[PDB]
DNA sequence: TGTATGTACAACCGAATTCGCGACATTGAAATTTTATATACGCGCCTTTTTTTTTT
């Protein structure tokens, strides 16, 4: 129907042998030892790029162990998509893995990392006039958008408008794929159907988030004061969602009871633009507002 | 299998809020106030006078 293992596919790739699985040729001269069958990547004290290695593993996968001697390696599809969305060169990570990881890069592990680096979305969701539309940087993308009931049918025929792509981006498609390619401006209504049809037909689309196509108007009555409590995970989570230069809303999985709304109020203020806040239930809306 | 939950849509209720007549106080003023003097009357009232009455 509309369920994707790729988001929740984390929890596998830890099984190897000893007869078929050979000691990694880098095992003699390799700062790490990538156990590809066990999916474990032990980052011992001998890795000089352990900080560089530690960050790369955290993107493509989840480091289960962070021991003082060596770390531990786990596989995460959301990490794989996140490490795919990380943007590190799939080949470049593998080789520094291969050279660093004494255990040779596993064949299945090597494919997933490259599959991370490039896949985790090869979709072609084009955008017009700084907005989202039914198009694609790649051709199979324009076909997906045009043949889309929500992307195409919900897409206005106009190729792109500075204001329409600005305003409408058939809802807000501020999460589309590569823009500045062939596409048509989509309406102001219903990206559920856009996503509910890329749902039904399994279109993993290499998506972005165009955060000042979070423009949306003359500036609202927002008091851009940072007097709301600021404490360090929120800001670097903000620094992650503020990214380079200007406020991008990402997905930032935050706890209710540790100042969750605090990042939202800042990002809402930072854009200096109209923003709505949605909480669980209305009674919690007052509690949270209280 | 018992229960916790968000949200509704409709009739009930009392709570809190702003308008002019009466009380006098106001200053404005006239009236009254005191005095001389002739006039003459008619108020009342003073003392004295005379009369009457009582008691021895």
Q: Is the CB of A283 under 7 A from strand B?
A: yes
Q: Is the CB of A284 under 7 A from strand B?
A: yes
Report the half-sphere exposure of A231 (CA within 13 A, side-chain side).
5
Contact A17, A87 (CB under 8 A): no
Phi and psi, residue A283, nearest 5°: -60, -35
The annotation status of A260 as a binding-site residue, yes or no, is yes
Contact A250, A238 (CB under 8 A): no
The span from the CA of A5 to the CA of A193, in Å, is: 20
CA-to-CA separations, A255 to A197, A226, A247, in angstroms, rounded: 31, 20, 21
The DSSP code sequence of A118-154 is H-S-------SSSS-BS--SSHHHHHHHHT-TTTTTT
Minimum CA–C1' distance nucleotide for A280: B6
Query: Interior CA angle at A241 toward A154 and A155, to 5°?
Result: 10
Q: What is the resolution of this structure in A?
A: 3.4
- Which method was used? cryo-EM
Q: Is the CB of A276 under 7 A from strand B?
A: no
Contact A128, A135 (CB under 8 A): yes
**Distance, CA of A230 to chain centre:** 25
The annotation status of A267 as a binding-site residue, yes or no, is no
The DSSP code sequence of A166-179 is HHT-----SS-S--
Q: Which residue is nearest to nucleotide B7 (CA to C1')?
A: A282
Enumerate the nucleotides of strand B whose atoms come under 7 Å of any protein CB.
5-8
The DSSP code sequence of A171-238 is ---SS-S--SSS--BB-SS-HHHHHHHHHHTT--------TTS---SS--S------S---HHHHHHH
Centre a 10 Å sphere on the Cβ of residue A106 and count the other Cβ atoms it contains: 21
The annotation status of A257 as a binding-site residue, yes or no, is yes
CA-to-CA separations, A60 to A42, A76, A97, A144, A234, in angstroms, rounded: 15, 7, 12, 27, 23
The annotation status of A220 as a binding-site residue, yes or no, is no
| The token pair that represents A270 in the structure block | 């930072």
Report the half-sphere exposure of A225 (CA within 13 A, side-chain side).
4
Q: Of A12, A87, A124, A110, which is closest to residue A133 (Cα–Cα)?
A: A124
**Distance, CA of A78 to chain centre:** 8
The annotation status of A258 as a binding-site residue, yes or no, is yes
To the nearest 10°, the Cα dihedral for A220, A223, A225, A228?
Answer: -100
Q: Is the CB of A274 under 7 A from strand B?
A: no
Minimum CA–C1' distance nucleotide for A279: B6
Phi and psi, residue A155, nearest 5°: -85, 125
CA-to-CA separations, A272 to A74, A169, A201, A224, in angstroms, rounded: 40, 19, 38, 8
Q: Is the CB of A253 under 7 A from strand B?
A: no
Residue A58, SS3 per DSSP: helix
The span from the CA of A281 to the CA of A116, in Å, is: 37
């Amino acid at each position: 129907p509309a369920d994707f293992v790729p988001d929740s596919v984390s929890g596998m790739f830890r099984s190897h042998d000893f007869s078929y699985l050979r000691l990694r040729p880098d095992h003699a001269s390799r700062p790490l030892w990538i156990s590809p069958s066990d999916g474990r990547i032990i980052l011992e004290s001998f890795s000089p790029l352990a900080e560089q290695a530690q960050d790369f593993l955290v993107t493509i996968a989840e480091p289960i162990s962070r021991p003082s001697h060596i770390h531990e390696y786990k596989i995460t599809a959301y990490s794989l998509y996140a490490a795919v969305s990380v943007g590190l060169e799939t080949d470049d990570i593998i080789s520094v893995l291969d050279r660093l990881s004494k255990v040779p890069v596993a064949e299945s592990i090597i494919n997933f990392i490259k599959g991370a680096t490039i896949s985790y979305g090869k979709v072609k969701l084009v955008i017009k006039h700084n907005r989202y539309f039914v198009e694609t940087t790649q051709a199979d993308i324009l076909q997906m958008l045009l043949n889309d009931s929500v992307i195409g049918p919900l897409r206005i025929d106009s190729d792109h408008q500075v204001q329409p792509p600005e305003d409408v981006l058939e809802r807000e498609e501020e999460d589309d794929d590569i823009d500045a390619v062939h596409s048509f401006e989509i309406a102001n209504e219903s990206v559920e159907v856009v996503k509910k049809r890329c749902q039904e037909i399994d279109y993993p689309v290499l998506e972005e988030y165009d955060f000042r196509n979070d423009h949306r108007n003359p500036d609202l009555d927002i008091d851009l004061k940072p007097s709301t409590q600021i404490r360090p995970y929120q800001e670097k989570s903000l620094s992650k969602m503020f990214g380079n230069g200007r406020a991008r809303s990402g997905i930032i999985v935050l706890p209710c009871g540790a100042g969750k709304t605090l990042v939202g109020i800042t990002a809402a203020c930072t854009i200096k633009k109209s923003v709505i806040v949605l909480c669980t239930s209305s009674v919690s809306v007052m509690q949270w507002r209280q």
